[PDB]
């Protein structure tokens, strides 16, 4: 939680959000709706994908036998070979464990960031017509019919339309 959204100021995830990774859940006069956000969901996805594309990789370098499983090579040479190979195992095993931990840290942090980024986008959309409840909700100081909610999701909410009324609920 480098960004403090996921597993942070948002209390927990929505096991119902089967539509995408991020989303809005509104409550108005008409009832209550949950919708997923394509842009943020898709970005988080694009990025994790990119990680995969990079990590699912084949090096075009062939390695051949220097050992012999059937008739064991000379002891000193085979011992040097065993030592080199074991040392190399140590390096890659480390490289793998580190790579995976670092990548998981960054993946999680990245998702947290995408959440924050979305929240802050909506916050910016509202401007002065809503206040932050601190749990990842915006209390809207005007009346938000289902078309309004929709407008907030498709980023077409004009704060000017509702400024007077909302402000007036000072």
């Amino acid at each position: 939680g480098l960004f403090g959204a996921i597993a942070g100021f948002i209390e927990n995830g929505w096991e119902g959000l089967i539509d995408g990774w991020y989303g809005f859940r509104h409550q108005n006069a008409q009832g209550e709706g949950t919708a997923a956000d394509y842009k943020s969901t898709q970005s988080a996805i694009d990025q994790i994908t990119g990680k995969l594309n990079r990590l699912i990789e084949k090096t075009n370098q062939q390695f051949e036998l220097i050992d012999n499983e059937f008739t064991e090579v000379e002891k000193q040479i085979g011992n040097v070979i065993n030592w080199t190979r074991d040392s190399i195992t140590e390096v890659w095993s480390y490289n793998a464990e580190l790579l995976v931990a670092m990548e998981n840290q960054h993946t999680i942090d990245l998702a947290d960031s995408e959440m924050d980024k979305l929240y802050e986008r909506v916050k910016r959309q509202l401007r002065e017509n809503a206040e932050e409840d601190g749990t990842g909700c915006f209390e809207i100081f005007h009346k938000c019919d289902d078309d309004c909610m929709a407008s907030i999701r498709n980023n077409t909410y004009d704060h000017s339309k509702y400024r007077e009324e909302a402000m007036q609920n000072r």
Binding site: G13, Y22, I66, A96, A101, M102, A111, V122
Partner: protein, 316 residues
Amino acid sequence: DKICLGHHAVSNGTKVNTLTERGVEVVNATETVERTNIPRICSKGKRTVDLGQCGLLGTITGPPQCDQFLEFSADLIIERREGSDVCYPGKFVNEEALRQILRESGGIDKEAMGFTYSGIRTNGATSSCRRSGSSFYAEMKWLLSNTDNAAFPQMTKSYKNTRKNPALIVWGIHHSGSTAEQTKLYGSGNKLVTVGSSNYQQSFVPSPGARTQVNGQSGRIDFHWLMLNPNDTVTFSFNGAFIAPDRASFLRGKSMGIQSGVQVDADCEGDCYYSGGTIISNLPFQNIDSRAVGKCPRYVKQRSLLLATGMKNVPE
């Protein structure tokens, strides 16, 4: 009144490790270390050779077993635990260097060395190299004295590699089971075999005497080999105990040798092989065989290293 934003979760996510915390539950993860075998050498797409009874070095000298393989072609060569390079008891000097050279050679193209012999036996044979009863290494002439105890003529033979690649030249030194049998085969008095080119230069004395009864023989054959450069020439000086090359070997193209204990299968296609199968995987790591060969995922100690592919998972 209100609009809220959130993220998904699942009831049962999977645990992964991070820089900072062990076993954090995230939504989805994927495996990074391959553990999945295919108990069969995936040969499809490449020309394969299974040697079985044949030993790899044997494909040059040509004891009974390797008669199938005296001029083989390959892309993938396969050694088997039962393989043998030998019929009449003996080791190859620098055996493994040669084995490695052969495993990458794409096969061998054999060719006569034009050796002619005067006033001696060319047809030495034994009850170990079975075929028509007693015989010998189909590429080696067992040079013997004209009759028992007959002093073996001091001889010299010679061969020029007249090809663009180099030439593999094997010869053998018969160490007799007793001083009696040596002078029975080659005549009394000292014996030497000298071998020289421009690269090589070495020489051999036979060592008669009794060793353990491997294959019913007590004496042994020391096999020696050299590489002969294009335009270069080999010379043999000798007066006994010399198992002569009849043909020389040339390397065709390119290949890869594996030591397998499992079936072949030209249905599936592969590129990483290990003694007990094939490893087909996209994963950048494997935990199967340290020693596996081909184009391979890096080998690691770890059974599993799960790579998160989803956000922190926080259920209700």
